[PDB]
Each structure stands twice: as structure tokens, then as C-alpha cells.
């Protein structure tokens, strides 16, 4: 991060990268795991599950907010889509 901020100031450790590196440290620098167990848990997608479980709270909150606001059916505006269909197939 120091090197990247020396390159460009906004190249900081993201929350994704920080959580990843700190989770790897927690996995392999605590007495619970051996090194191979931590490697296997990283490989099989422990942080994918972490992110999914975390963002599930926000997604359910979004669903409840939309239900409480009683928003109607969405239809994407035609002006936001570029139709590049072939001339005649």
C-alpha cells in the first residue's frame, strides 16, 4: 500500500483487501489452524462466504425497504439501451 500510494495517492488498501489479508492472518496466526488448514479454507472460499453472509443483511434490508416504500414494478427506460440489432437475419 505504501508503494502504491507512492505511485498514486488513492491506491490504498481497500476494505476487501484489508479484510482478506487480516482474515488470512487470523486463520494462520492463531493456534486453531495449521498452515495447510488455513490454505484449504482460503482455497475453498471462506471469504466468499463471509462477503455473502455480510451482504445478505444489506440485501434483506433493501428488500424490506422496497416493500415498505411500496415501489411498483420496474421497467428500464428505452433511452438507456442501445439497440444494435442486425439489419435482417
Partner 1 sequence: GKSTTLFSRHTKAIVWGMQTRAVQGMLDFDYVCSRDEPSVAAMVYPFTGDHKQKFYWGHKEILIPVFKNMADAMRKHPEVDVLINFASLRSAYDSTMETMNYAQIRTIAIIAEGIPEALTRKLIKKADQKGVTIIGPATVGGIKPGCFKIGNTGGML
Ligand X SMILES: CC(=O)SCCNC(=O)CCNC(=O)[C@H](O)C(C)(C)COP(=O)(O)OP(=O)(O)OC[C@H]1O[C@@H](n2cnc3c(N)ncnc32)[C@H](O)[C@@H]1OP(=O)(O)O
Q: For residue 27, how many other CB atoms are within 10 A of its CB?
A: 19
- Counting contacts by CB under 6 A, is residue 52 touching ligand X? no
Q: Which does 40 bind (CB under 5 to 8 A by kind): a second copy, ligand X, partner 1, none?
A: a second copy
Q: For residue 46, how many other CB atoms are within 10 A of its CB?
A: 15
As a whole number of angstroms, the distance between CA 37 and CA 20 comes to 16
Among 2, 67, 70, 76, binds partner 1 (CB under 8 A): 70
38: Cα separation from own chain's centroid: 21
Residues 18-77 that bind a second copy (CB under 8 A): 40-41, 44-46, 48-49, 52-53, 56-58, 60-69, 71-77
Q: How far is the CB of 65 from a second copy (least distance, A)?
A: 5
Rg (alpha carbons) of the chain, rounded to whole number: 22
The angle formed by the CA atoms of residues 36, 40 and 46, to the nearest 5 degrees, is: 135
Interacting residue ranges for partner 1, rule: CB under 8 A: 7, 70, 72, 82
Interacting residue ranges for a second copy, rule: CB under 8 A: 40-41, 44-46, 48-49, 52-53, 56-58, 60-69, 71-89
Amino acid at each position: 500500500e505504501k508503494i502504491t500510494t507512492s505511485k498514486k495517492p488513492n491506491l490504498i488498501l481497500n476494505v476487501a483487501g484489508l479484510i482478506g489479508v487480516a482474515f488470512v492472518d487470523m486463520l494462520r496466526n492463531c493456534g486453531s489452524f495449521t498452515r495447510e488448514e488455513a490454505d484449504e479454507y482460503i482455497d475453498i472460499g471462506a471469504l466468499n462466504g463471509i462477503f455473502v453472509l455480510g451482504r445478505s443483511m444489506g440485501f434483506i434490508g433493501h428488500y424490506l425497504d422496497q416493500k415498505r416504500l411500496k415501489q411498483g414494478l420496474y421497467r428500464h427506460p428505452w433511452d438507456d439501451i442501445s439497440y444494435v440489432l442486425p439489419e435482417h437475419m
